[PDB]
Amino acid sequence: MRSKFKDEHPFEKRKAEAERIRQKYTDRIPVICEKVEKSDIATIDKKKYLVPADLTVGQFVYVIRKRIKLSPEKAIFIFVQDTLPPTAALMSSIYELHKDEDGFLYITYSGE
């Protein structure tokens, strides 16, 4: 359940960056998207995202699908603090509830 972005970078710098990003893009959600350790899915090329707050969770799944070029028949599940968020929910609603103390919103994506 550990995050590599969390372990590689100190909390203070992470926190400072998130505040820096929140100030510059007040309409966007800073997102860290990582793969769950033991899933067969591929690994995302780009870890960190500026996500529009009006985007739904399901819309963000779609961006994850097309960033890994996941075959359309394949399945993919997104986890926010080891929960499956509803696709119809706004990422702004997910962010206010599940933002990390550093200010980032941490997702893990799997395949089962």
Short mmCIF file of all heavy atoms in Angstrom, two decimals, residues 42-70:
data_model
loop_
_atom_site.label_atom_id
_atom_site.label_comp_id
_atom_site.label_asym_id
_atom_site.label_seq_id
_atom_site.Cartn_x
_atom_site.Cartn_y
_atom_site.Cartn_z
N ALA A 42 -0.04 -2.76 -17.32
CA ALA A 42 1.19 -2.05 -17.58
C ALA A 42 1.37 -0.91 -16.57
O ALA A 42 0.49 -0.61 -15.77
CB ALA A 42 1.21 -1.50 -19.01
N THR A 43 2.54 -0.28 -16.62
CA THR A 43 2.86 0.84 -15.75
C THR A 43 2.75 2.14 -16.53
O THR A 43 3.24 2.24 -17.66
CB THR A 43 4.25 0.69 -15.14
OG1 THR A 43 4.28 -0.44 -14.27
CG2 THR A 43 4.64 1.94 -14.36
N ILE A 44 2.07 3.13 -15.93
CA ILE A 44 1.85 4.43 -16.56
C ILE A 44 3.18 5.14 -16.80
O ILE A 44 4.09 5.10 -15.96
CB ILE A 44 0.90 5.26 -15.69
CG1 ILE A 44 -0.56 5.03 -16.05
CG2 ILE A 44 1.17 6.72 -15.86
CD1 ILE A 44 -0.97 5.71 -17.36
N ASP A 45 3.29 5.82 -17.94
CA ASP A 45 4.51 6.54 -18.28
C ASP A 45 4.68 7.79 -17.41
O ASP A 45 5.81 8.13 -17.02
CB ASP A 45 4.51 6.91 -19.76
CG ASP A 45 3.39 7.86 -20.14
OD1 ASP A 45 2.33 7.82 -19.48
OD2 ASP A 45 3.57 8.65 -21.09
N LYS A 46 3.59 8.49 -17.11
CA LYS A 46 3.64 9.80 -16.45
C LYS A 46 2.89 9.74 -15.13
O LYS A 46 1.67 9.55 -15.12
CB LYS A 46 3.06 10.88 -17.36
CG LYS A 46 2.98 12.26 -16.73
CD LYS A 46 2.83 13.34 -17.79
CE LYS A 46 2.44 14.67 -17.16
NZ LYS A 46 1.02 14.67 -16.70
N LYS A 47 3.60 9.96 -14.03
CA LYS A 47 3.04 9.71 -12.70
C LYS A 47 2.09 10.82 -12.25
O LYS A 47 1.08 10.54 -11.60
CB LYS A 47 4.17 9.55 -11.69
CG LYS A 47 3.86 8.64 -10.52
CD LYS A 47 4.91 8.77 -9.43
CE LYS A 47 5.94 7.65 -9.51
NZ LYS A 47 5.29 6.32 -9.64
N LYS A 48 2.39 12.07 -12.58
CA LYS A 48 1.75 13.23 -11.98
C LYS A 48 0.88 13.95 -12.99
O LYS A 48 1.27 14.13 -14.15
CB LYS A 48 2.81 14.17 -11.40
CG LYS A 48 2.28 15.43 -10.74
CD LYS A 48 3.43 16.39 -10.46
CE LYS A 48 4.70 15.65 -10.08
NZ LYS A 48 5.85 16.56 -9.82
N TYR A 49 -0.31 14.39 -12.56
CA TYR A 49 -1.30 14.96 -13.46
C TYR A 49 -1.94 16.21 -12.89
O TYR A 49 -2.17 16.32 -11.68
CB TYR A 49 -2.41 13.95 -13.78
CG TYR A 49 -1.94 12.75 -14.56
CD1 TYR A 49 -1.54 11.59 -13.91
CD2 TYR A 49 -1.88 12.79 -15.94
CE1 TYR A 49 -1.11 10.50 -14.62
CE2 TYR A 49 -1.44 11.69 -16.66
CZ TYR A 49 -1.06 10.55 -15.99
OH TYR A 49 -0.62 9.46 -16.70
N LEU A 50 -2.23 17.15 -13.78
CA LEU A 50 -3.10 18.29 -13.50
C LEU A 50 -4.47 17.96 -14.08
O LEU A 50 -4.66 17.98 -15.30
CB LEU A 50 -2.53 19.57 -14.12
CG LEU A 50 -1.66 20.41 -13.19
CD1 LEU A 50 -2.42 20.65 -11.91
CD2 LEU A 50 -0.32 19.74 -12.91
N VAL A 51 -5.42 17.67 -13.20
CA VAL A 51 -6.73 17.13 -13.58
C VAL A 51 -7.78 18.21 -13.35
O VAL A 51 -7.81 18.80 -12.26
CB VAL A 51 -7.07 15.86 -12.78
CG1 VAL A 51 -8.45 15.34 -13.16
CG2 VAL A 51 -6.02 14.79 -13.03
N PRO A 52 -8.63 18.50 -14.33
CA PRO A 52 -9.69 19.49 -14.11
C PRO A 52 -10.67 19.03 -13.03
O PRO A 52 -11.04 17.86 -12.96
CB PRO A 52 -10.37 19.60 -15.48
CG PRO A 52 -9.40 19.02 -16.46
CD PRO A 52 -8.61 17.99 -15.71
N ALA A 53 -11.08 19.98 -12.19
CA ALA A 53 -11.95 19.65 -11.06
C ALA A 53 -13.34 19.22 -11.52
O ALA A 53 -14.01 18.47 -10.80
CB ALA A 53 -12.04 20.83 -10.10
N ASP A 54 -13.79 19.69 -12.68
CA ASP A 54 -15.10 19.30 -13.20
C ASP A 54 -15.10 17.92 -13.84
O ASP A 54 -16.18 17.42 -14.20
CB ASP A 54 -15.58 20.34 -14.22
CG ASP A 54 -14.49 20.79 -15.17
OD1 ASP A 54 -13.36 21.03 -14.69
OD2 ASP A 54 -14.76 20.92 -16.38
N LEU A 55 -13.94 17.29 -13.99
CA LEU A 55 -13.88 15.95 -14.56
C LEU A 55 -14.46 14.94 -13.58
O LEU A 55 -14.23 15.02 -12.37
CB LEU A 55 -12.43 15.60 -14.89
CG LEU A 55 -12.14 14.45 -15.85
CD1 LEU A 55 -12.27 14.92 -17.29
CD2 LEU A 55 -10.75 13.87 -15.60
N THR A 56 -15.24 13.99 -14.10
CA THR A 56 -15.73 12.92 -13.26
C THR A 56 -14.64 11.86 -13.08
O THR A 56 -13.64 11.83 -13.80
CB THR A 56 -16.98 12.28 -13.85
OG1 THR A 56 -16.64 11.52 -15.01
CG2 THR A 56 -18.01 13.34 -14.22
N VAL A 57 -14.84 10.99 -12.09
CA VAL A 57 -13.90 9.90 -11.86
C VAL A 57 -13.82 9.01 -13.10
O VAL A 57 -12.73 8.70 -13.59
CB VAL A 57 -14.29 9.10 -10.61
CG1 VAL A 57 -13.49 7.81 -10.53
CG2 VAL A 57 -14.09 9.94 -9.36
N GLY A 58 -14.98 8.63 -13.64
CA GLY A 58 -14.99 7.78 -14.82
C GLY A 58 -14.28 8.40 -16.01
O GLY A 58 -13.61 7.70 -16.77
N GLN A 59 -14.42 9.72 -16.18
CA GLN A 59 -13.69 10.40 -17.24
C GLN A 59 -12.19 10.29 -17.04
O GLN A 59 -11.42 10.21 -18.01
CB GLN A 59 -14.11 11.87 -17.31
CG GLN A 59 -15.48 12.12 -17.90
CD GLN A 59 -15.85 13.59 -17.88
OE1 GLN A 59 -16.59 14.05 -17.01
NE2 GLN A 59 -15.32 14.35 -18.83
N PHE A 60 -11.74 10.29 -15.78
CA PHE A 60 -10.31 10.17 -15.50
C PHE A 60 -9.83 8.75 -15.74
O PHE A 60 -8.70 8.55 -16.22
CB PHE A 60 -10.01 10.59 -14.07
CG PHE A 60 -8.57 10.41 -13.68
CD1 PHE A 60 -7.58 11.19 -14.24
CD2 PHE A 60 -8.21 9.44 -12.75
CE1 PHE A 60 -6.25 11.02 -13.88
CE2 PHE A 60 -6.89 9.26 -12.40
CZ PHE A 60 -5.91 10.05 -12.96
N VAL A 61 -10.64 7.75 -15.39
CA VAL A 61 -10.34 6.37 -15.78
C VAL A 61 -10.05 6.30 -17.27
O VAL A 61 -9.09 5.65 -17.71
CB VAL A 61 -11.49 5.43 -15.38
CG1 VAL A 61 -11.06 3.98 -15.53
CG2 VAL A 61 -11.94 5.71 -13.95
N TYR A 62 -10.87 6.99 -18.07
CA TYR A 62 -10.70 6.96 -19.52
C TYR A 62 -9.34 7.51 -19.94
O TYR A 62 -8.69 6.96 -20.83
CB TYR A 62 -11.83 7.74 -20.19
CG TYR A 62 -11.81 7.66 -21.69
CD1 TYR A 62 -12.33 6.56 -22.36
CD2 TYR A 62 -11.26 8.69 -22.44
CE1 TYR A 62 -12.31 6.49 -23.74
CE2 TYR A 62 -11.23 8.63 -23.82
CZ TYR A 62 -11.76 7.53 -24.46
OH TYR A 62 -11.73 7.46 -25.83
N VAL A 63 -8.90 8.60 -19.30
CA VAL A 63 -7.58 9.15 -19.60
C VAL A 63 -6.50 8.14 -19.23
O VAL A 63 -5.51 7.98 -19.96
CB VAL A 63 -7.38 10.49 -18.87
CG1 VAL A 63 -5.92 10.90 -18.88
CG2 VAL A 63 -8.25 11.57 -19.51
N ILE A 64 -6.68 7.43 -18.11
CA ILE A 64 -5.74 6.37 -17.75
C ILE A 64 -5.75 5.27 -18.79
O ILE A 64 -4.70 4.72 -19.15
CB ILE A 64 -6.07 5.83 -16.34
CG1 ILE A 64 -5.99 6.94 -15.29
CG2 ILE A 64 -5.11 4.71 -15.97
CD1 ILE A 64 -4.70 7.72 -15.31
N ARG A 65 -6.94 4.93 -19.31
CA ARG A 65 -7.04 3.90 -20.34
C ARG A 65 -6.23 4.27 -21.58
O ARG A 65 -5.53 3.43 -22.15
CB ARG A 65 -8.50 3.68 -20.72
CG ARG A 65 -9.39 3.20 -19.59
CD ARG A 65 -10.69 2.63 -20.14
NE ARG A 65 -10.47 1.36 -20.81
CZ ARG A 65 -10.70 0.17 -20.26
NH1 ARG A 65 -11.18 0.07 -19.03
NH2 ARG A 65 -10.43 -0.93 -20.95
N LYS A 66 -6.32 5.53 -22.01
CA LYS A 66 -5.66 5.96 -23.23
C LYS A 66 -4.22 6.40 -23.01
O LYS A 66 -3.50 6.61 -23.99
CB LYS A 66 -6.46 7.10 -23.89
CG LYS A 66 -7.82 6.66 -24.41
CD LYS A 66 -7.72 5.35 -25.18
CE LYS A 66 -8.50 5.40 -26.48
NZ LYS A 66 -8.81 4.04 -27.00
N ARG A 67 -3.78 6.55 -21.76
CA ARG A 67 -2.37 6.82 -21.52
C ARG A 67 -1.55 5.53 -21.51
O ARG A 67 -0.41 5.51 -22.00
CB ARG A 67 -2.19 7.58 -20.21
CG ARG A 67 -0.86 8.32 -20.08
CD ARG A 67 -1.03 9.83 -20.27
NE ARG A 67 0.18 10.45 -20.81
CZ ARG A 67 0.38 11.76 -20.87
NH1 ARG A 67 -0.54 12.62 -20.45
NH2 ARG A 67 1.52 12.22 -21.38
N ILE A 68 -2.11 4.44 -20.98
CA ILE A 68 -1.49 3.12 -21.10
C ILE A 68 -1.87 2.42 -22.40
O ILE A 68 -1.34 1.34 -22.69
CB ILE A 68 -1.83 2.20 -19.91
CG1 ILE A 68 -3.13 1.44 -20.13
CG2 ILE A 68 -1.97 2.99 -18.63
CD1 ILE A 68 -3.55 0.63 -18.92
N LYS A 69 -2.75 3.02 -23.21
CA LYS A 69 -3.28 2.40 -24.41
C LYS A 69 -3.89 1.03 -24.07
O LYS A 69 -3.64 0.03 -24.74
CB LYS A 69 -2.22 2.28 -25.50
CG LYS A 69 -2.77 2.05 -26.90
CD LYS A 69 -2.03 2.87 -27.95
CE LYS A 69 -2.28 2.34 -29.35
NZ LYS A 69 -1.50 1.10 -29.61
N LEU A 70 -4.68 1.01 -23.00
CA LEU A 70 -5.34 -0.22 -22.59
C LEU A 70 -6.33 -0.66 -23.66
O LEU A 70 -7.12 0.15 -24.16
CB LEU A 70 -6.06 -0.03 -21.26
CG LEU A 70 -6.54 -1.29 -20.54
CD1 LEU A 70 -5.36 -2.14 -20.10
CD2 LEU A 70 -7.39 -0.91 -19.33
#
